[PDB]
Amino acid sequence: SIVSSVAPGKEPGSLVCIQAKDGKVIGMGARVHCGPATVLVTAGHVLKKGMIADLYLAKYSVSSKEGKRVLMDPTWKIEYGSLNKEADVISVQVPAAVWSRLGVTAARVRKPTVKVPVLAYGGEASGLLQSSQGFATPDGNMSVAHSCSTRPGWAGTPLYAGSDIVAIHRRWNLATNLSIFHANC
């Protein structure tokens, strides 16, 4: 798996970091279309931390030439998924105002295909992102096997196939086949 630096602002427009209050990146996520609206999608064990501590959605701002972030409200409604279950995927009805302030566009969820090329993103700061290349294969249940290298703090990051998201990375590999749970939309 080839690992590469991603220049500030050149990551996909849907991607967001999830930070603790001291700025540490503890997970990733993305804005995706969900019926007539959009949702955050991330790992359930990442979102669970925001029940007892403050988490922030974070993304590099091209116009400000620095990172920006917005406090997460744990009472934002859950669209699908769960904080504690095996698939470890959850989606949240984040207000459009928050996505607007961070510059986050919505991506499309697509079904994975066999050995589809994929990119996964993560990093220690919103202008210090990196990507890892790999391939993804769905298992006929709710998961995808994939070959992207990841680091701790990449939990919840999408696997991108071209423009679209086909999976959610779980933990530092088996990702969740997002289209399975996205059918709740």
Author numbering: 5 to 176, 183 to 195
Manuscript text:
Sobemoviruses encode serine-like 3C proteases (Pro) that participate in the processing and maturation of other virus-encoded proteins. Its cis and trans activity is mediated by the naturally unfolded virus-genome-linked protein (VPg). Here, we solved a full Pro–VPg 3D structure of ryegrass mottle virus (RGMoV) that demonstrates the structural changes in three different conformations due to VPg interaction with Pro. The overall fold change of Δ117Pro is typical for CLP and is very similar to the structure of SeMV Pro.
We crystallized and solved 3D crystal structures for two catalytically active forms of Δ117Pro: one in its VPg-free form, the second in its VPg-bound state with fused VPg at the C-terminal part (Δ117Pro-E/A-VPg), and one catalytically defective Δ117Procm form with S159/A mutation. The expression of the Procm variant confirmed the importance of S159 for the catalytic activity of RGMoV Pro. First, in the absence of VPg, L87 shifted towards the VPg-binding pocket. Second, the α1 helix in the VPg-free structure is also slightly shifted towards the empty VPg binding site; although, the position of the catalytic triad H49, located on this helix, is minimally affected. These two conformational shifts are driven by the presence or absence of VPg, since they align well in the Δ117Procm and Δ117Pro cases, which do not contain VPg at all. However, in the Δ117Pro chain B, Δ117Procm, and Δ117Pro-E/A-VPg cases, D92 is directed towards H49, as would be expected in an active Pro. Surprisingly, conformational differences were observed between the Δ117Pro, Δ117Pro-E/A-VPg, and Δ117Procm states, with the only difference being the S159/A mutation. Different crystallization conditions could be at play, but it is very likely that these differences are actual representations of natural conformational oscillations in the Pro molecule.
